């Protein structure tokens, strides 16, 4: 999900043109207009006005080019922008209906030149998507053939029979992960021009896809100013072509299984959904949008229209703008780097910003800070395999290596969730809060997988409760690894086809597996113990198994470990519902209550699984889009694509609870901690089920996007990236929202003496009372509530306490508060400076006088009070706050005397 930079970018630049552009003069363009990736073949394509370049992506290295000549440059014009024959591989409703054709075909990619020509380049390479996934670990499939394909092999100058660099580098040739897979070589490919197409109108935009006629063909949807043209090409020959009338079209896009043109008229941005078999267009005007469209985007199944000032998320189903947000800057380039995070480039082009889909800033490079052309202005960027390659018009590019958040155990309610990132260098960062303690955890733990290979695609990484086990899965090699963190011991199980992995609480692994025998899938439940003596197989650990029905297709699997266990109600053995497994299938979703016995120390050994219900989830709630589900009392609450939805009988009727939820941080004892649009909202699961007001909701103002929370301390932790060309670091900043929580509870009219008792033990609680009195007296607010709350604090002692706490809180709030509000505070507060002086004298708390001496003088309404305070401090020191205070007072007195004395005080002291 999230993306952070591992380190500052690696700077490179494309080689100059090999051939001579002119007959006598040579012009090395070294100017990159656009870059795009072809993960299906593990190749990255860069475009320049005079040439195309093709690199092997994972082992970054140029492999091919075209270097068009001056004759072609004059006849067809300079290259303008390239597009890919992307395989949609699902329904469009306008072009393809049956998707069974899928399968790997031709690697075609087109480039529109400066005078409306399509060149239709083709890359031929002896590779397949499965082979690429196995060899390079690029997550490409989701609908060694000798060394003949290796290229750019550097043999040693002496003893040429030995290779010093085949791929990344030879280690000059462990039983967990691993036939020469280690080299990770660079594969050769052949680029070739196939056919040139002449267009008599400007190509505003174009999109090519693959369809099935019967034989495989390609369809090009190209938007001319007068409308849309759909051209069918079988073998690079123009087959039947269709024309549809669209006015002032700006950009085509295929979103939510439907093709739509996007025009711009009267300050309107009409979206015209096109249906070509029916030959019809449906126009959907959008809300007020004065500026022209910059680029359209499809993220999470809903369109995202970008403007030079704002970005609006258009919902395809209901056909209405559901969200709008504008960043501080003005957009120049915008594109999704992963499924959730997207990249925004400001007008300066020197810095990039990782924003989440809802507009919350995640990461930013704050260049242009007057550090001084040696400036790198970005023109495009491509992200793949956790590596962002940005490019510039100056012929240079930056290769970034990014982290990547990987989903954890989905909200085990017992303890806070862990936030873990993974890297393509088989490295894992793990951050977990401190839980019970009052001191925040500032450190990130680094785990290195036991392997020197670099083609491992870590598809699953889960931490069990108590952080005493680490279950990870490498898909490209089908290897499960259980890492005991306490003893730092790895155990590997080979030939495992796990489709999903979850922890059922401590030592239990719910594993949705795929069985090669008949391609059937099952759900096993292993019990990986800490110590395995004979190197057992993963099969023998299973104690429960559920065979998924052959016809039913599983969309996802969710495992929730409950915090409070309901009594089974029948050596009773005290059977309780320790956890619950909620399988989601296209035909029916099954909820397996995990009936277990709880020992006093823990070790919730599970006894059986009971199928609670077999609810047929309606298609209206998009079961395929469910990301989390909990079987609440007599119903299911599930986080849909963007909303929380209830399904609780009471005929089974659905209901929408929250409409703009983008993330769920974690669930801790019946609290959800969701992240609504530009807000971090803490509910209680009962209240959310009943559709009541949130427990609290605090805004997200800056890059402090929450990653984890500790509700007992009312803290939210945020991952910050200290970025700089010299070095990059990841740090954790903790924001304490205790004051906001108290304010929200007071707004709820909660009876006092429970809030104080609830948060009395919290260290920031005093300061939580602060920031409320000060803010309330500022402007004009009802002050009586906070005054009573502060007053009762320190009064409910286990001799009278004399109310030291209220004294200190009031002194701190009053001193930091400006003049013209002291009188108001003293009006609300039934006390006077003389009363405060008497109170401290009774308590002999010289610190109050030390911190309130400035307020005492120039009060709201000689000067022997200073000497008295000094003497009191001295006595207290005799009976290092007091010492420091006395020193400061003495210094101030000396200064005053110099400006004006101190001898008198000294004499009085004696």
């Amino acid at each position: 999900m999230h993306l952070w930079p591992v380190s500052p970018p690696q700077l490179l630049r494309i080689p100059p043109r090999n051939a001579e552009l002119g007959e006598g003069t040579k012009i090395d363009d070294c100017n990159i207009l656009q870059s795009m990736t072809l993960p299906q073949a593990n190749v990255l394509i860069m475009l320049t006005p005079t040439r195309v370049l093709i690199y092997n992506f994972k082992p970054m290295a140029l492999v091919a080019s075209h270097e068009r000549t001056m004759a072609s440059l004059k006849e067809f014009g300079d290259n303008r922008s390239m597009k890919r024959s992307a395989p949609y591989n699902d329904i469009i409703e306008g072009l393809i209906s049956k998707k069974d054709s899928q399968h790997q075909g031709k690697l075609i990619f087109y480039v529109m030149t400066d005078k409306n020509f399509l060149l239709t380049y083709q890359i031929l390479k002896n590779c397949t998507n499965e082979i690429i996934f196995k060899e390079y670990g690029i997550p490409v499939i989701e609908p060694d053939y000798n060394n003949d394909d290796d290229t750019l092999t550097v043999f040693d100058k002496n003893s040429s029979s030995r290779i010093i660099q085949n791929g990344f580098g030879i280690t000059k040739e462990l039983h967990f992960l691993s036939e020469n897979i280690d080299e990770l070589p660079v594969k050769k490919l052949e680029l070739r021009l196939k056919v040139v197409l002449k267009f008599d109108y400007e190509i505003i935009d174009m999109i090519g896809i693959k369809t099935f006629s019967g034989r495989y063909e390609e369809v090009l949807i190209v938007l001319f100013p007068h409308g849309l043209q759909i051209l069918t090409i079988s073998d690079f020959k123009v087959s039947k072509s269709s024309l549809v009338e669209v006015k002032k079209g700006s950009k085509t896009i295929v979103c939510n299984k439907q093709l739509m043109v996007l025009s711009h008229d009267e300050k309107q941005t009409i979206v015209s959904i096109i249906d070509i078999e029916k030959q019809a267009v449906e126009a959907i005007p959008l809300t007020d949008t004065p500026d022209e469209l910059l680029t359209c985007l499809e993220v999470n199944g809903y369109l995202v229209v970008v403007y030079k000032e704002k970005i609006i998320c258009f919902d395809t189903r209901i056909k209405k703008v559901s969200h709008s947000w504008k960043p501080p800057f003005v957009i120049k380039l915008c594109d999704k780097i992963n499924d959730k995070i997207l990249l925004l480039v400001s007008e300066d082009s020197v810095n990039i910003h990782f924003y989440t889909e809802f507009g919350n800033l995640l990461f930013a490079t704050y260049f242009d800070e007057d550090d001084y052309a040696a400036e790198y202005k970005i023109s495009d960027f491509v992200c793949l395999d956790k590596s962002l390659i940005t490019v510039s018009h100056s012929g240079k590019y930056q290769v970034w290596k990014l982290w990547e958040e990987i989903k954890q155990t989905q909200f085990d309610f017992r303890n806070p969730k862990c936030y873990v990132l993974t890297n393509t260098n088989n490295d894992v960062i793990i951050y977990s809060p401190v839980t019970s303690s009052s001191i925040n955890n500032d450190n990130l733990q680094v785990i290195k997988l036991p392997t020197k290979t670099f083609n491992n695609h870590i598809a699953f990484v889960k931490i069990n409760s108590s952080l005493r086990l680490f279950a990870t899965y490498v898909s490209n090699k089908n290897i499960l690894l259980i890492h005991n963190l306490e003893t730092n011991m790895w155990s590997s199980f080979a030939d495992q086809n796990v489709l999903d992995l979850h922890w059922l609480g401590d030592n239990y692994l719910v594993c949705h597996m795929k069985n090669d025998d008949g391609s059937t899938n099952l759900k096993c439940l292993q019990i990986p113990l800490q110590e395995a003596n004979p190197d057992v197989e993963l099969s023998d650990y299973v104690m429960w198994e559920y065979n998924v029905p052959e016809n039913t297709i599983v969309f996802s699997l969710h495992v929730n470990t409950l915090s409070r266990y309901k009594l089974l109600k029948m050596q009773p053995d005290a059977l309780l519902k320790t956890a619950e497994i909620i399988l989601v299938t296209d035909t029916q979703t099954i909820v397996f209550d995990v009936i277990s016995t709880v020992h006093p120390c823990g070790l919730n050994i599970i006894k059986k699984f009971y199928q609670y219900l077999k609810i047929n989830i309606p298609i209206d709630v998009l079961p395929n889009k469910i990301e989390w589900i909990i079987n609440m009392k007599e119903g299911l609450l599930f986080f849909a694509d963007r909303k929380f939805i209830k399904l609780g009988k009471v005929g089974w009727q659905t209901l929408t609870l929250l409409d703009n939820i983008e993330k769920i941080i974690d669930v801790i004892r019946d609290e959800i901690f969701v992240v609504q649009g530009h807000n971090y909202v803490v509910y209680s699961l009962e209240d959310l089920w009943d559709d009541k007001k949130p427990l609290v909701s605090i805004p997200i103002e800056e890059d402090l996007y929450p990653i984890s929370t500790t509700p007992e301390t009312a803290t939210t932790h945020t991952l910050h990236c200290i970025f700089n060309a010299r070095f990059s670091k990841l740090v954790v900043k903790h924001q304490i929202y205790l004051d906001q929580l108290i304010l929200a509870k007071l707004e709820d009219n909660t009876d006092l003496e429970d809030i104080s008792h609830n948060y009395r033990f919290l260290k920031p609680y005093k300061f939580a009372l602060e920031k409320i009195l000060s803010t309330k007296i500022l402007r004009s607010d009802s002050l009586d509530d906070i005054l009573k709350l502060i007053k009762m604090y320190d009064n409910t002692d286990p001799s009278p306490p004399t109310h030291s706490g209220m004294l200190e809180i009031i002194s701190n709030c009053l001193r930091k508060i400006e003049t013209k509000y002291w009188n108001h505070l003293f009006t609300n507060l039934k006390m006077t400076p003389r009363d405060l002086l008497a109170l401290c004298i009774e308590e002999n708390e010289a610190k109050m006088l030390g911190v309130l001496l400035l307020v005492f003088l120039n009060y709201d309404e000689x000067x022997x009070x200073x000497x008295x305070x000094x003497x009191x401090x001295x006595x207290x020191x005799x009976x290092x706050x007091x010492x420091x205070x006395x020193x400061x007072x003495x210094x101030x007195x000396x200064x005053x005397x110099x400006x004006x004395x101190x001898x008198x005080x000294x004499x009085x002291x004696x």
């Binding site: 803290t715 903790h734 001193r815 120039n858 400061x888 200064x895």
Partner: protein, 167 residues
């Protein structure tokens, strides 16, 4: 770490510097006549101290020399608060270089009695190092102002590895 000292010259800005961020550094120790708070900046914890902020202020001239910084805040709605900057910006120099700071107040209060460009030009003429505009009503640049102040505050040949390849 080092204890920076920053005389201020209203009292709204000091109040806004606190009561704004609860980022684990709430415990701002307070001395006599001055307020000290630790500020977070790129894994650096720097103790910023405000020395002072009617019936008094005859001693703050002695504070200027000890203070590492001398902030200037002026009300933008009236010219007097803007014109009197010169007397104090000379006085600070009359009383070791300092990281001078210029800022207006009540920017978002009818407004802009003095053009922002004119203020920038005059600040540059006086030699001000950093100029920022803030407001009492939830200022959107006070945090940026203090961040710039913290940044401005203060905080060899290559080793030749002559060893050749193993031959």
């Amino acid at each position: 770490l080092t204890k920076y000292k920053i005389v201020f010259l209203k009292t709204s800005l000091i109040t806004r510097f606190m009561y704004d961020t609860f980022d684990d550094h709430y415990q701002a120790t307070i001395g006599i006549d001055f307020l000290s708070k630790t500020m977070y900046l790129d894994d650096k914890t720097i103790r910023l101290q405000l020395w002072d902020t009617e019936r008094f202020r005859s001693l703050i001239p002695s504070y200027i020399r000890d203070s590492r910084v001398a902030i200037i805040v002026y009300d933008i709605t009236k010219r007097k608060s803007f014109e009197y900057i010169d007397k104090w910006i000379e006085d600070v120099k009359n009383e070791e270089n300092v990281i001078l700071c210029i800022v207006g107040n009540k920017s978002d209060l009818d407004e802009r009695q003095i053009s922002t460009e004119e203020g920038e030009k005059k600040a540059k003429l006086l030699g001000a190092k950093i100029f920022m505009e803030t407001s009492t009503k939830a200022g959107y640049n006070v945090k940026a102002l203090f961040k710039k102040i913290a940044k401005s505050l203060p905080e060899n040949k290559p080793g030749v590895i002559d060893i050749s390849t193993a031959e």
